[PDB]
Structure 1
Amino acid sequence: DSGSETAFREIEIGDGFLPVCSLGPGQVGHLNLGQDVSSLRFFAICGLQEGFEPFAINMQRPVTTWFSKSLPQFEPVPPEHPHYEVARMDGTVDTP
């Protein structure tokens, strides 16, 4: 809206970054990382000769992806949970 090309002008490197997508209901996308540079369309227009290596270009195996499986599963209550806490009260006497 201001007119600059970059969406985020300053990002910390931190612990790294990963190609990510969130598809809604009844939505179809094609997450082409760029295993084949010829298969990567519009890359000559944007990304090539600007210094952008296609992500996952030499990686011979297709990149293993991780999807947010919406199946409920029991996991231990974190000690850092900002809403619930679990106390390990000892046995003592007249109390288990």
Structure 2
Amino acid sequence: SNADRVRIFRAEKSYTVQSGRWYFEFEAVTTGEMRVGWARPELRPDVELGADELAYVFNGHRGQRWHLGSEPFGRPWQSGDVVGCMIDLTENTIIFTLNGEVLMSDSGSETAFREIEIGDGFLPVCSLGPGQVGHLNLGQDVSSLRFFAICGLQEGFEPFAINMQRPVTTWFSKSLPQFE
């Protein structure tokens, strides 16, 4: 029996962060096997996110946090729900929200992961199992973030897209009349 095909959406490695406090969202359209969170710049093939050391993710199918394996955490997704992903590379913590409300661990903690090591740094990541549908928003248009202002903005987290600069081709001219 062939294994499930899982799509993994890496960010360009050149956007990797080793400092600061960053924020992005992920909308669950379906309600099944998807994961979202923060990845190392290297991922191994044919391994699910957070099964090993290379990612720290939330699985909202039933509510799990994944890093070196799974644990019960948060609560399950409904269609339309938006997961907020936060990483704090000064405090060294990861926090998830669901429709702007922090997802608490089973033990009662706001931090989903703590005492994380900066190492090679982090990138936003998601995985989509077969059939599944979900959209990242890395916050190019900050106002488009649905729950940032409710939890993340005042808390000092910045939209991750600030780390992403459009490549450009420039055309120079000395002609004032062209720039009126």
Bucket of the pairwise TM-score, normalised by the shorter protein? 0.5 to 0.7
Max Rg structure: 1
TM superposition shift of 1:60: 4.9
Which residue is 2:127 aligned to?
22
Instruction: Determine which structure has the larger strand proportion and give its number.
Output: 2
Which residue is 2:162 aligned to?
57
TM-score, normalising length: structure 1:
0.59
TM superposition shift of 1:14: 0.3
Matched, 1:35 2:140: yes
SS at match of 2:109: coil
% identity of equivalent residues: 100
- What is the Cα-based RMSD across aligned positions, in Å? 1.7
Instruction: Determine which structure has the larger helix proportion and give its number.
Output: 2
**Alignment partners' CA distance in 1, 2:110 and 2:118:** 20
Instruction: Structure 1: give runs of 5+ residues left out of the alignment.
Output: 63-96
TM-score, normalising length: structure 2:
0.33
Displacement over 6 Å in runs of 4+:
none
Instruction: Structure 2: give runs of 5+ residues left out of the alignment.
Output: 1-105, 168-180
Higher-RCO chain (CA-CA 8 Å, sequence separation at least 6): 2
SS at match of 2:110: coil
TM superposition shift of 1:59: 3.8
Q: How many residues align?
A: 62
